[PDB]
Design a protein around this ligand. Structure first.
Ligand code: ADP
Ligand code: BEF
Ligand code: MG
Ligand code: ZN
Ligand code: ZN
Ligand code: ZN
Lengths: 291, 204, 668, 30, 171, 103
């Protein structure tokens, strides 16, 4: 294992408990993260909103910089730390009632990147984008964790994690088997989340001289599905992501390729986005959202 | 035989491999692109350079070292293309058609591919009356398998010599050959009237 | 000793020569090679060019040095290095980069500067050559010219999005978590056959993590060449530039650039059967340096690029967006602005060979200067783009003026009547055959954003095509809601349209509006309408004939314009600088005069319009901006009103019926 | 020869390392 | 209607250094041992191979302990895994034989066979263990039964019966 | 199968690249024999075809001296064997390829 990952995970779960923002005159000081955890237990939701400003304030923002620069690498550590914190205080909401997935969303990033500002050096990092929603697809299931039926000693392995791509369980329900050639998936022991792809488009005011509009594909995973109608300006916060592309086969420039036998595979990709959450920009509900 | 130019219609299957002269009008010349002849690789481990000859429209790249010493050695070797080391030939395709006079009664003209290699590129332009001399080589068929019944082959003419039927103005050069005749014209005088009357003398 | 294989380059000798050139280069050498020794300066020529440049490189902190290859030709000791640089791009460029780093650190050390060497040795310096010989086009590049420096100039048609390019793979061992990082070398990644650890050995433990790899920018730019020479019957050719790293997102559609780089060739895979390559190689160009600015054309308008430059400075793209004006040049510009005949001088400087088109040239000058680009705090903006229509008898040199404007402006497209089409201007969806994907592409109006769009044979255009001009000529934007795209596009283009009256010649019997024969909503949008008239005047005809016949006195003669003119380089510099650093504001007296004049005009012949009021506003602002004044005065409005009245020949038209008094309108 | 030499940097670029492998004798040509 | 494309090769630059275990280096050492072994100031093996070529006997009789002096490491490799190194020394003999034959032609050869005569210790037949498997051993005893000569193929030309595709595998 | 009427035993067409002894072979164009081959499609004559119904067509394989004896749109009377070719899907991968060999 990695020592640095353990360090960042333990610090994460440490300040999920030790952090406490003041309430100024009215309310003294309260544990904002613990207050949000109590809110989570009360409403039985599935996603926790964490302000980036507080993380920047804490510990001279070194941990904030570390989590912003390498969000993808530390994400499983973040999930584990949050699970342990939930176990410490109010562990009732841990399970679905098999297991309930906890989503972590960061909001109020210091800066906003336009679609034309996407850069390769920001790949895998945390940032925010602002675009206009053009096409929205159906909310479809995706394999959070995948179960399969064995080939030799036909039997079903239960609740195995499914990565970004198809995975094969190395272990077997029968330990003597150690055969994985033919797996038959079963939906019962396979977890799922909500998947929806939204094609955002650059806003008019951000377009340079002469350039025709540029657009990006944004994937909304979790409760944020169907949160934006087509033709609305929304602010997306998430992690910069890459997805394989097979169309750029004749483009100029040497195509990266992997050799392994032969083991050939063209490493061509296109940039996309995975957004943690989306923010847009009777008389009772209307009357409520006023000062 | 090469003395007598032939129309595209008369270029039968009997003439393959020969050196023939096709007289026609150039229709559609593509632009010069590099056609690889001998792709060159480098094995960094064994410090060799391995060459793969190519004589087909399509080729398969190499990945494992072919160096004899590196072949006997069981140590893994990887090759890389070296475009600067590889051999290229300037390539062009011209697709000459038939002159209107050559088409028999009731038919339409039909075209014939021309392959241009080396320093002959850029010598043929659309709308040129030329007598291209070349080797009438065949090529493996790339059409439908249903139409292919046997070892069907598509043909072409590897260009060797190009004789423009009408000299371009931009290619003029004041050598003795043109100098003597130009002197003959001017010394006789009356160049304006002679050149005016010489345009369509049948018109009165 | 020790020349590299396949090359004529020796590392030690080339580094020695490059250091020698860096140490002892003076611009007087380039002046000698330019045969411009009569222009030798005592100050700049004496000073060491590249040593100073490396200095300001050190203080500023940039990492890229732009080298002029003709400077290498100037230095005798490095004449061979010039040819070595052309023939061997990558090796010699790497040599230059290493030498630049060496020279930087050596210069810090020798002077014992307090500046720390921590940053310097860690940084990576790049050399970007340019001015590498001629162009030669692309039809003339034989396959023997693969991997050589070439110089290309053309128009940027389309620019693809940013394409990530893998630099380091991140294969992860499933079993023992042996996460090895594999750098890419010569565009090849080698997979570990088994686990690279000795204790753990599992070939299937490898599963590449796409997301944790480190990528680099790559942008493909479609450039349509405009070579200085064109062979007979050769349609324009499109070549695919491939920029990298900081140059990404620098060149916008419609920019007329000159690019230098490495002429490459890459096999293209016949996707019918995988891992089978076609024997014909696709040709593209890697890009090392881009030169957008030129002294023969106006610089790009900073107002239209105000939004991106602040972020581009952080992006470290470091391209010459704007030309740097020397203090001596600024003083010269101010001195010229102090001249008494500034307006007439600048008028006759544009299109110098055109004789006796005085009002036309003045209006063209005012359009080139443009009006103030107002901005509203609430929202919206009023742009000072002046739209000019030319109408009159044939052979009045309208097309020549159109070509002059099309040459001078930074961005512009010259279209002609029936050639243009409504989807052709605005935008269209096209299938890029390289990616075999429907790719969005812009049209002539959007291409001409921030510049003057020249339209010839305006009358011949169908009114159907003309409809899209209605929104562009007023709102400076085009809102397209065709299939697949629903948005608004900014087209800050000032139209310069030339047309003929109906019957291809002016008819004094018909009224002015009948002779022009355009819908009133269109003609209302035009700020200036010129009735260029061809009338048989013996003095004028004699002068014009003398001018032309004198133009036919040498093979490539000089202008017969008796009056002196500003050379086009300084004229472009002056117009540009006045555009960036002057922003006139109307004064109250100008406001009163404008109101009075508007009421005077607004009292059949062409009718007055509120667009005419905004037209006087823009023209007075432009006239003030020419004079470098920061405010608008009464004389500016008077001149604008004079121009509007004279262009339509109002001094010779009967009020009730718009018949031009032919005897009265006569002018030399 | 002289006894003095220009100051040189310490870090060599990776491209320099790649170039240094392809080195052959100078008697080939000039 | 095209000829098969050739694949050339050529050494251009000095790559990574040839390791001692490299087969080419083994062959070079063997060739030098054949060409430079001196006994009584006589090139015993070179002259023996020359005579063997002359008498058309394509084989070489190399004394085993003569090899330990020239290269103890290669002798250890031979006595450790003979089934891998012995073809290499046969190849070296073949190359030297080709050179000698071509040189002496002034007034093709099959793969030569190596015959190893040794004087080292002889393992008793009962003393053979599991360790000696695939290791050169010296044995002594009495020959009781010699079988009939059985012909084995060393180079045979094959042809696909349907494809009419000639090929030549070497054993 | 086309060039002969009776079904011959199928011998795959392998181009000889090497000699029987492994020597390289250089193909000799200009000594090898090539035969002209052309396929034409004959459709029902419009004069005799029923009106308002789709036409029916047959494929004719011409060879050697019979090539290029017709122009598209001609009216022809082609006579030849109505041969059927191919396994016609009977061999595991909707009828048989049927064509009129040209006499
Ligand atoms: N006043 C003029 N000054 C300079 N050149 C002129 C003038 N009038 C006509 N010409 C010349 O006559 C020709 C007419 O110009 P052109 O733009 O083609 O005509 P049009 O106005 O019909 O488009 C050009 O070669 C131009 O140089
Ligand atoms: F005869 Be011109 F082009 F107006
Ligand atoms: Mg005109
Ligand atoms: Zn099992
Ligand atoms: Zn090798
Ligand atoms: Zn491992």
């Amino acid at each position: 294992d990695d020592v640095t990952g353990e360090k960042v995970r333990e610090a994460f779960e440490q300040f999920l408990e030790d952090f406490s923002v003041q309430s100024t005159d009215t309310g003294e000081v309260e544990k904002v993260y613990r207050a949000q955890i109590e809110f989570m237990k009360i409403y039985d939701l599935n996603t926790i909103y964490i302000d980036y400003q507080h993380l920047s304030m804490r510990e001279n923002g070194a941990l904030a910089m570390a989590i912003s620069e390498q969000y993808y690498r530390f994400l499983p550590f973040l999930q584990k730390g949050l699970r342990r914190v939930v176990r410490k205080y109010a562990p009732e909401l841990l399970n679905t009632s098999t297991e309930r997935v906890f989503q972590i969303s960061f909001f109020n990033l210091p800066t906003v990147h336009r679609i034309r500002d996407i850069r390769s050096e920001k790949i895998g990092s945390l940032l925010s984008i602002s675009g206009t929603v053009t096409r929205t697809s159906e909310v479809r299931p995706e394999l959070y964790k995948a179960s399969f039926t064995c080939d030799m000693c036909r039997a079903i392995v239960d609740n195995v994690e499914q990565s970004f791509k198809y995975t094969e369980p190395t272990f077997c329900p029968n330990p003597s088997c150690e055969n994985r050639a033919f797996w038959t998936l079963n939906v019962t022991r396979s977890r799922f989340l909500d998947w929806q792809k939204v094609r955002i488009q650059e806003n008019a005011n951000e377009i340079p001289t002469g350039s025709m509009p540029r657009t990006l594909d944004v994937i909304l995973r979790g409760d944020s599905v169907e949160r934006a109608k087509p033709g609305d300006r929304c602010k997306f916060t998430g992690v910069e992501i890459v997805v394989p592309d097979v169309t750029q086969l004749g483009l100029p420039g040497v195509k990266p390729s992997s050799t392994l036998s032969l083991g050939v595979r063209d490493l061509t990709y296109k940039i996309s986005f995975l957004a943690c959450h989306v923010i847009s920009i009777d008389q009772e509900v209307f009357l409520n959202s006023l000062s | 035989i090469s003395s007598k130019p032939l129309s595209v219609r008369q270029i039968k299957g009997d003439f393959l491999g020969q050196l023939i002269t096709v007289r026609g009008i150039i229709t559609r010349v593509s632009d010069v692109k590099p056609a690889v002849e001998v792709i060159a690789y480098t094995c960094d481990q064994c410090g060799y350079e391995v060459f793969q000859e190519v004589n087909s429209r399509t080729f398969t790249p190499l990945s494992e070292c072919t160096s004899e010493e590196c072949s006997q050695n069981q140590t893994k070797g990887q090759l890389f293309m070296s475009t600067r080391a590889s051999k290229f030939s300037a390539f062009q395709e011209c697709k000459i058609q038939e002159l209107s006079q050559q088409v028999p009664v009731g038919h339409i003209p039909r075209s014939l591919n021309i392959h241009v290699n080396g320093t002959l590129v850029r010598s043929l332009s659309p709308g040129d009356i030329v007598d291209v001399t070349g080797i009438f080589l065949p090529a493996p068929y790339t059409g439908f398998k249903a139409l292919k019944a046997g070892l069907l082959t598509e043909t072409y003419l590897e260009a060797q010599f190009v004789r423009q039927h009408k000299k371009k103005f931009a290619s003029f050069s004041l050598t003795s050959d043109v100098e003597e005749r130009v002197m003959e014209l001017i010394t006789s005088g009356d160049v304006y009237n002679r050149l005016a009357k010489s345009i369509a003398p049948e018109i009165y | 000793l020790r020349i590299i294989w396949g090359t004529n380059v020796s590392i030690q000798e080339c580094t020695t020569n490059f250091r020698n050139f860096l140490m002892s280069f003076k611009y007087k050498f380039r002046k000698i090679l330019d045969e411009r020794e009569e222009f030798i300066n005592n100050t700049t020529d004496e000073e060491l060019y590249y040593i100073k440049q490396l200095n300001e490189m050190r203080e500023l902190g940039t990492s890229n040095l732009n080298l002029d290859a003709r400077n290498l030709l100037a230095y005798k000791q490095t004449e061979d290095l010039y040819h070595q640089l052309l023939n061997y791009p990558q090796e010699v460029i790497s040599i230059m980069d290493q030498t630049i780093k060496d020279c930087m650190v050596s210069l810090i050390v020798d002077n014992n500067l307090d500046y720390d060497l921590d940053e310097i040795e860690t940084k990576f310096y790049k050399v970007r050559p340019y001015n590498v010989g001629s162009c030669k086009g692309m039809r003339e590049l034989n396959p023997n010219d693969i991997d050589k420096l070439i110089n290309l100039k053309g128009l940027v048609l389309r620019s693809t999005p940013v394409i990530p390019d893998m630099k380091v793979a991140f294969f992860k061992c499933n079993v023992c978590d042996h996460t090895m990082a594999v750098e890419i070398d010569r565009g090849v990644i080698q997979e570990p056959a088994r686990c690279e650890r000795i204790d753990c050995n599992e070939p299937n433990s490898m599963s590449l993590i796409h997301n944790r790899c480190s990528f680099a920018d790559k942008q493909v730019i479609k450039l349509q060449e405009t070579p200085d020479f064109v062979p007979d019957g050769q349609t324009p050719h499109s070549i695919s530039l491939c920029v990298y790293d900081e140059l990404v997102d620098s060149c916008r559609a419609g920019d007329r650039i000159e690019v230098t780089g490495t002429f490459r060739s890459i096999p293209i895979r016949a996707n019918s059967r995988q891992r089978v390559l076609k024997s014909l190689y696709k040709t593209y160009v890697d890009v090392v340096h881009v030169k957008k600015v030129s002294d023969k054309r106006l610089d790009v308008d900073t107002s239209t690029i105000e939004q991106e430059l602040m972020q581009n400075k952080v992006d470290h793209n470091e391209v010459e967006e704007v030309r740097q004006i020397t203090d001596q040049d600024l003083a010269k510009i101010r001195e010229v602005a102090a001249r008494e005949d500034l307006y007439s001088l600048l008028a006759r400087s544009i299109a110098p060979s055109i004789y006796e088109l005085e009002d036309v040239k003045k209006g063209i000058l005012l359009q080139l200067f443009g009006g103030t680009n107002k901005t509203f705090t609430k929202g919206g903006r009023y742009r000072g783009d002046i739209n000019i229509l030319l109408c009159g008898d044939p052979s009045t040199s309208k097309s020549q003026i159109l070509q002059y404007v099309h040459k001078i402006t930074p961005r512009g497209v010259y279209t002609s009547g029936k050639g243009s089409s409504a989807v052709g201007l605005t935008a269209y969806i096209t299938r890029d055959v390289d990616t075999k994907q429907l790719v969005l592409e812009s049209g002539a109006l959007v291409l001409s954003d921030g510049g003057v769009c020249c339209i010839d044979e305006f009358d011949k255009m169908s009114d159907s095509t003309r409809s899209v001009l209605h929104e562009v000529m007023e709102q400076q934007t085009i809102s397209i809601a065709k299939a697949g795209i629903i948005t608004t596009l900014n087209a800050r283009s000032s139209i310069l349209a030339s047309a003929n009256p109906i019957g291809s010649r002016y008819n004094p019997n018909l009224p002015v509006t009948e002779n022009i024969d355009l819908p009133p909503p269109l003609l209302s949008r035009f700020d200036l309408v010129y009735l260029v008239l061809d009338k048989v005047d013996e003095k004028n005809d004699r002068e014009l004939a003398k001018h032309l016949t004198n133009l036919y006195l040498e093979d490539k003669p000089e202008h017969i314009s008796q009056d002196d003119v500003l050379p086009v380089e300084f004229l472009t510099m002056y117009i540009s600088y006045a555009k960036e650093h002057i922003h006139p504001i109307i004064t109250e007296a100008a406001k009163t005069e404008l109101v009075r004049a508007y009421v005077g005009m607004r009292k059949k012949r062409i009718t007055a319009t509120t667009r005419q009021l905004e037209s006087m506003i823009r023209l007075a602002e432009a006239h003030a901006k020419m004079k470098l004044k920061n405010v608008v005065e009464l004389e500016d409005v008077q001149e604008a009103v004079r121009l509007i009245r004279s262009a339509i020949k109002d001094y010779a038209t009967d009020p009730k019926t718009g018949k031009i008094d032919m005897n009265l309108v006569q002018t030399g | 020869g002289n006894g003095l030499g220009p100051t040189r940097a310490s870090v060599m670029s990776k491209n320099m390392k790649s170039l240094s492998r392809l080195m052959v004798d100078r008697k080939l040509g000039v | 209607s095209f000829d098969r494309p050739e694949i050339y090769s050529a050494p251009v630059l000095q790559g990574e250094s040839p390791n001692d275990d490299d087969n080419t280096e083994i062959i070079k050492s063997f060739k030098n041992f054949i060409l430079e072994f001196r006994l009584d100031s006589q090139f015993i093996y070179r002259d023996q191979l020359r005579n063997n070529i002359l008498v058309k006997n394509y084989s070489l009789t190399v004394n085993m302990e003569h090899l330990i002096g020239y290269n103890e490491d290669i002798y250890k490799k031979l006595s450790d895994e003979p089934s891998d190194i012995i073809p290499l020394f046969e190849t070296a003999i073949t190359q030297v034989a080709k050179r000698i034959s071509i040189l002496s032609r002034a007034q093709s050869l099959p793969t030569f066979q190596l015959i190893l005569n040794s004087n080292a210790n002889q393992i008793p037949l009962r003393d053979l263990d599991s360790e000696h498997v695939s290791k050169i051993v010296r044995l002594s005893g009495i020959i009781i039964s010699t079988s009939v000569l059985s012909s084995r193929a060393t180079y045979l030309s094959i042809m696909c019966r349907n494809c009419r595709h000639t090929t030549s595998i070497t054993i | 199968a086309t060039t002969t009427l009776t079904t011959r035993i199928p011998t795959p067409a392998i181009y000889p690249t090497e000699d029987t002894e492994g020597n390289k072979l250089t193909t000799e164009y200009g000594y090898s024999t090539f035969i002209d081959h052309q396929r034409i499609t004959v459709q029902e004559m419009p004069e005799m075809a029923p009106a308002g119904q789709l036409p029916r067509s047959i494929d004719v394989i011409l060879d050697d001296d019979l090539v290029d004896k017709t122009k598209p749109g001609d009216r022809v009377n082609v006579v030849g064997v109505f041969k059927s070719l191919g396994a016609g899907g009977m061999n595991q991968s909707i009828g048989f390829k049927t064509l009129i060999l040209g006499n």
